[PDB]
Design a protein around this ligand. Structure first.
Ligand SMILES: [Zn+2]
Ligand SMILES: [Zn+2]
Ligand SMILES: [Zn+2]
Ligand SMILES: [Zn+2]
Lengths: 370, 370, 370, 370
């Protein structure tokens, strides 16, 4: 019982996406088949398209999907046709990390999210000529009008929420907001600095406001992002080309910030931000540089300051509870991540990729045809 | 009401200590005057003697004192003459860090512990000719037969404990044991690696056994320290000159250790030990290199592993509760830190310094004359 | 160097306060002398006036003072004349609980706050005829135009804050807000119910909104308090005379609330509220019934639900950091506790007491003459 | 592909078990078929046999199984034939509680553990005449020579461990040890009291010793259990018929215990034990009285003491990590729970039930025939 889809396909390293007819098989096991309404586009999709992470091509990418369950496998227990879902990253659900509530550190994370196929090497998508299309990208491959996900990464959300907006809660927004709320455990009355005011950093700024922080510092080089950060809840905005960011943060906070989040991936920014921590302060790291990149820290500064540096994957959340919390906060007017979004038709995916790379659009969302 | 003391005096950078008569004034305010029974000697005393940290000379050092309260200032509330006390580091007791239970990060730490005088620039000790001797070293200057401490760093311990053994609980042993129990929060069933098997590292090994760790790895280059570590509770001992320590720890733990403590101060050891962390593992840092020393970490390894690096001062404990817990564990036969100790008369301080520097003695304790 | 004050004096059990001239001595030790601008009035003052807690009479009560430091004792380290301070409860600062950052559980709490005199049995206030007036009430006795406090319960606040509003941050508002932020650790996306919408409960409602709770339920019997609670950040208001509160909370939250705070002191309300907890939910208890009062719980409900019941004193905060956080949140427009307040001249203290007892005024603040 | 088993069957309320031939079907889905070596017997089995919890009869009970995987369903990912497993309680693995690492509070706990059948109402066991035998008891029904369990409650353990001893780690021993290590988070230097010295209480005593507690108090009425508790790591033993337990604990601990665990299920013991808590102390509750049973607490004592009361199910652990930690501690000589055990052949199940009820045997283990 296969069915026709329209998909954006990456066929060559660094080449534009092609919009193509394809076919997807029926769900098996505890998979759900999702009619995809809209999917966020991320720099991470483009990094895979460029083969810096060489997921085998031709491939259907996309890892910020939102849609409606159309069919369920025989093992699905908790989703039903008609449910609205946000598609998040894959996890195995049975390893020690998954079992402890930390699926972000699943032993099988890279196989399930970057493998290009299921554990048997099979794909669920075929192209117009019947050839396999590498898929299972973040256990969803949601750059297509239909997607398969496992029940545990298809997150039910209230039907009254505006579904086409919600796909980026499956990755980038959960990463920034979860880094603040869960990993760093930012709380009432603390100071927080976001190094980077892209979609992840803005999500962190907004999350720190929700969590009760009284000083919320956005650091970037783009004046319009700094202006937007102030509108989204930051108390201070620092242009790092114009001041010494370490000295500036020390002035604002009286000696250094309680919590910081590095989302640029630039090791010089990371090394500098660690110096901006205050007594017992904690830097969380979510931006990834090229493999092999090192950062340095001053040992005595870390020691005498009681400083912490912590790596964070995907916001280290429990998505099935955390994504609906973010939806509710948004519905309450407390989490305006719609301000990060521009919508595009799937057909315009290459323009959205360009706008993502140029920074003109913090979070493109592609609307799928049906 | 001044009184005569015998003191070890550092008069010149890098020069041997001289044993000299001196005089100490009566306690004021909330000071207690302590008849010092025995004091640990630390590399940190020798680093100050060598003026790498230039506490003004001539100075009376010593920061691991144990003794009997002989007199109290008029503001002392909770100590009385005859009480047995361990002398720990100074803290102001009124800053935000002190008020939160984290005196190790007191805003006034360096003034109170390394200033060489009280806040008015006055010393409580004078030499035989009546000249000031810089003092207040770790709020005690316990290389002398009598010492002044404030009530909040004179820690009451049970009179049935063997008092002459207990002074090192005021610094090095509390640092290693507190790093494990408090900062890292090592708990039942976890894996722990000590990088360094000096007095601090051995204390950490013993503390990890108390706290319930099931894999306890001692890393050093001295075979006799590794042999001793196995006797004191380590499950594994690694000679880092003989194996790749990162690979060896990964083998023992199935991928990396939950908790690690760096006490050598060697930045290459620190950078290497951070690589040995397992998923969501935490490296604690207590060994201090020369100021300005940097260490590096692989950003993606820290990020993808959810690794934490944390600086730790003095074991980040509450000494008035933690030191008596360590005494009780010792009395119960569960904390054999006596195995680190060799006793020397104060007159032999320079031989104890030599044995500390050569590594022949993990923890010299100097017995004071009276 | 004594000085004249105007004080409200409780001379007889249950009798109206009398406004009287008095004299206060100069500060000693680490006391500060505060020119009191305005002081909150609490039911707790009236309970002592009524001698249910028999603080010896004649007595000057008041434990929510705000004012300006006028003089300091010779041991004061961190306050200076001209500083704006909120006066909170007394703690000894040297016991194990104080040393761990939990002065709310100070071993000397009742002596320091309810003793009626200092530890030597001496009062700092004398009446017009020169007789002692029992004082040191919550280490302040701030129903007077001047008050003595110790440095550790005189909390510096920014001079730009409206000082006359801030005294209730020293007790009732810190109790409600700290119970939520610190003891219960309410966090983003959780559900919270306040049993009681007096000043403490309203503070808890406002604090839960600051901390990120997405369901915030106010429970009371007074329609105007429920209406006000919705304006101050509650998502739901329940009149417990009109619905079954347990069933109603279960409906709103899908099975029970994550966090609850009991501030009425009514044991039937407490026992009922514990039933309203959801899976792994926690009830915090701040309202005190008469001594000897018991509450009951269903053992299997607590066991099978993983429920927690926790007693909370004074919001279990670190006041010197927490009170300035609440001031900053108020200045940012995020903590509108001014909506609880009505101002009265000290001369009208008995009318404010009446309005407190009748519930007409949630938090009277008395303005002091000078 | 069904296969023959020998099973202990409960056919009538309160009646002796009957040993009977039966047949079990092949595993499906993510089930594993286990050749059961030995199974603990619990009062909880007898409570179901007596129909106080009316699991439908005829039924095969047993919920402390240990055995060897003989066959796997097609969805099993992480177990293979030949693996040694301890069988613990069932959880769904996909609800919010499971997803957060708290399967003890699974939304489906009672269906999965007390339903008497799978979710379709089907049993996997049939008796000699072919009639259904109610099963799936704690997702195992391990009073039989073969058992079906789901992969997520079949916990792999090292093959070198003595397998026949390990079944009680699947319930009673994990409950006592996990209550101490996980729920209460007993840590180095704390005081702990076990109310009850049955198998659960003894496990808690042993776990508190592992976790570093320096005062470990066993409370019971049976002198031989108190004597055994001292041998297994308790520092103090209290016969509650001979002293006032509250006063005695207050004397031993200097005012009350940091942590307590109630395992008798007697509400008078619970209410009394809550009074024995010290400042900021926590009582954990694992013993279950009859449904509808209430306990009381003094509100002011709980409030002024900052006391906590917490319900605990199954030790609130992650069994796949916690059970192997307990096995390792046992192999290291640090967890001597073999001292609780007496072995019996399955044929003697009714004598083991009698010895359990009389208290003569703390933890019977039944050896299965094959
Ligand atoms: Zn996994
Ligand atoms: Zn301080
Ligand atoms: Zn105190
Ligand atoms: Zn579940």
């Amino acid at each position: 019982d296969t069915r026709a889809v329209t998909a954006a396909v990456a066929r060559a390293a660094g080449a534009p996406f092609s919009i193509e007819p394809a076919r997807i098989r029926a769900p098996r096991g505890d998979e759900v088949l999702v009619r995809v309404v809209a999917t966020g586009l991320c720099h991470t999709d483009l990094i895979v398209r460029d083969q810096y992470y060489p997921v085998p091509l031709p491939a259907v990418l996309g890892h910020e999907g939102a849609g409606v369950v159309e069919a369920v496998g025989p093992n699905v227990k908790t989703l039903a046709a008609g449910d609205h879902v946000v598609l998040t990253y894959g996890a195995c659900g049975h390893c020690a990390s998954c079992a402890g509530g930390h699926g972000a550190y699943c032993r099988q994370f890279f196989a399930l999210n970057f493998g290009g196929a299921d554990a048997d090497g099979q794909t669920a998508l075929r192209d117009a000529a019947g050839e396999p299309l590498h898929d299972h990208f973040f256990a969803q491959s949601s750059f297509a009008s239909y997607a398969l996900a496992r029940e545990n990464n298809a997150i039910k959300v209230p039907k009254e929420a505006p579904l086409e907006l919600l796909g980026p809660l499956g990755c980038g927004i959960q990463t920034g907001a979860g880094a603040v709320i869960n990993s760093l455990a930012v709380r009432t009355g603390s100071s927080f600095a976001s190094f980077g005011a892209g979609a992840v950093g803005m999500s962190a700024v907004m999350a720190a406001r929700i969590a009760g922080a009284t000083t919320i510092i956005a650091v970037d080089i783009v004046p319009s992002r700094l202006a937007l950060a102030l509108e989204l809840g930051a108390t201070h905005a620092i242009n790092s080309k114009e001041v010494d960011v370490v000295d500036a943060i020390r002035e604002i906070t009286g000696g250094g910030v309680d919590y910081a989040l590095e989302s640029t991936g630039l090791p010089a920014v990371l090394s500098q931000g660690i110096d901006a921590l205050g007594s017992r302060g904690t830097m969380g790291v979510v931006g990834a540089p090229k493999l092999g990149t090192k950062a340095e820290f001053d040992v005595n500064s870390l020691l005498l300051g009681g400083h912490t540096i912590r790596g964070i994957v995907e916001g280290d959340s429990v998505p099935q509870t955390f994504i609906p919390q973010l939806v509710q906060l948004h519905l309450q007017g407390r989490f305006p991540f719609d301000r990060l979004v521009k919508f595009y038709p799937l057909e315009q995916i290459n323009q959205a990729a360009a706008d993502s790379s140029s920074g003109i659009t913090l979070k493109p969302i592609l609307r799928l045809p049906h």
